[PDB]
């Protein structure tokens, strides 16, 4: 017969102002700042805060099969997280699209 209601003032509970619009205005470094940001929040309490990065990544980067790069990486490669930085750098070049930054 438990749990006494209470309150908070952080904003929404755990969240970060960060996301953008397109790799183009992201330096590798902010991509690193972004993705590793799953290393933290994900393992956290809730998955209504993860779907935020999850679906920006999936959006801006396009191919090969979004999340799959984040999640089921590749056996002989980089497993967490500078290989999704790597292997992504490929796609956009063979399929037209511009790249990272300064």
């Amino acid at each position, epitope marked *: 017969d*438990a*749990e*006494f*209601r*209470h*309150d*908070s003032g952080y904003e929404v509970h755990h969240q970060k102002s960060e996301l953008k619009n397109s790799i183009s205005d992201y330096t590798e470094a902010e991509f690193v700042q972004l993705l590793k940001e799953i290393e933290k929040e994900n393992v956290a309490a809730t998955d209504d805060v993860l779907d935020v990065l999850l679906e920006h990544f999936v959006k801006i980067t396009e191919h090969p099969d979004g999340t799959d790069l984040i999640y089921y990486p590749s056996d002989n490669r980089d497993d967490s997280p500078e290989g999704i930085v790597k292997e992504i750098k490929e796609w956009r070049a063979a399929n037209g699209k511009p790249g990272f930054k300064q």
Partner: antibody
Amino acid sequence: QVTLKESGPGILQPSQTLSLTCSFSGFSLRTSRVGVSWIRQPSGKGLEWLAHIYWDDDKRYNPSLESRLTISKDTSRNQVFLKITSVDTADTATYYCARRGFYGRKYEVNHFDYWGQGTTLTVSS
Amino acid sequence: DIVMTQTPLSLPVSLGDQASISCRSSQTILHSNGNTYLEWYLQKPGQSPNLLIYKVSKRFSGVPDRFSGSGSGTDFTLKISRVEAEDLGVYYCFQGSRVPLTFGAGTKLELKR
């Protein structure tokens, strides 16, 4: 200036119904945000907790009671209430209303800064 | 109901003598939002309580740097390193994470002779 004032009959009689009124000064119950708890202490014993309201008429009762207890307020009047049904000899007690305050904006820092004096009820026929 | 436990239930001493009490919550009081809503109350003779310390260890308005109190999870302690008269009274620990919100039973710090 904040001060808390309980009030009642002070001398009831068995299986009936009480009403406790708790009353504020110096500040206001609308954008105060604080909550209000009823805690009673029996003549020559400890302390026990009866109920609680929140800045938005939210009401949370001790299960080891609940059915008897009834808590409420008015912001216009600027006071919090408490009915206990079929009052029994067991209710014989000094009753305390209590503000559940905090450190401003840091809402989750909730304690009981300020407790009133106490309104004493004897329930004997 | 839920139970909080005090040790001692009566601690008598003379003035300027260091004092210290302890409360253990039958099962952890660490509230889902993360914090440990435990308080340390006091009933000076013939008048109300009287908060002192909230959230394990943050000391409330105007209560001297002397009335410390640390702890964690279930164990928690209070200390007066200078018992004075404004200190002698009943001391109740308390919880605030689960309904109901239960005080200890009450230690009666007091004058020794």
